[PDB]
């Protein structure tokens with residue numbers, strides 16, 4: 001990839017642009033997504049090149065595809081998935097997204113995570129805003145900016161952050177593992193069944209429980225106490241209990257009592273087929 005051939009189409013959201021890669025200057029070439037860095041240190045740049053090598057290393061159906069790279073001034077290039085983040089897509093198109101449909105995306109995400117697991121990668125940022133929609137029937141894990149490789153010996157890894165998706169051990173000890181991704185997956189499943197009703201978002205609900213008057217750096221500590229005393233995100237409207245139970249089992253204070261992404265994949269599919 002040569003950067004004089006990337007024609008800028010629009011800003012998408014660290015920064016991501018929609019571009020056309022068009023060496024024939026023909027407007028024929030394909031539209032792609034281009035990630036780069038806003039204000040870049042050699043530290044950010046060193047983690048960005050890891051991300052790039054984590055993405056190239058992954059070839060799965062529910063993981064956005066690596067296309068290439070281009071420089072010097074690094075840009076990451078990936079397939080353009082035309083419907084954007086599952087988080088906005090759900091807000092936009094709730095009327096034609098039914099529960100069978102929620103469960104479809106759910107199982108596509110587990111399958112994507114399962115695959116990550118077999119490479120010993122830890123995602124760290126599982127949330128609906130990092131899931132891309134390719135079309136009505138397919139979603140993909142679409143960002144890997146916080147993903148980490150487990151060390152050969154240890155089966156966990158230590159490190160602003162998305163605290164309302166974090167497992168207790170990540171909040172208290174900065175421990176990230178397949179088990180903390182599962183905790184987070186539970187929050188992703190919660191999200192879906194709330195249909196992203198803004199005041200049912202995990203931050204709004206947790207702040208309600210903590211007290212909205214709580215501020216600054218104490219939020220994280222009160223969140224830690226809530227989770228220790230088995231405070232949890234409530235069952236959202238219309239969520240069938242069987243499905244809430246999957247969430248609550250993902251949100252177990254005990255790390256190895258949490259389900260595997262295999263367990264979850266299969267348990268979601270079986271539930272799917274009975275509605």
Ligand SMILES: Cc1cc(Nc2nc(O[C@@H](C)c3ncc(F)cn3)c(F)c(N3CCOCC3)n2)[nH]n1
Pocket residue numbers: 012013016033034064078079080081082083084085129130131132141142143
């Ligand atoms: C890497 C990538 C991003 C996309 N598509 C996309 N990305 C968006 O936001 C970026 C920041 C993003 N990247 C990765 C994610 F996982 C989630 N979001 C959009 F906003 C959007 N839209 C489509 C056209 O209307 C605007 C929304 N479409 N395809 N491939």
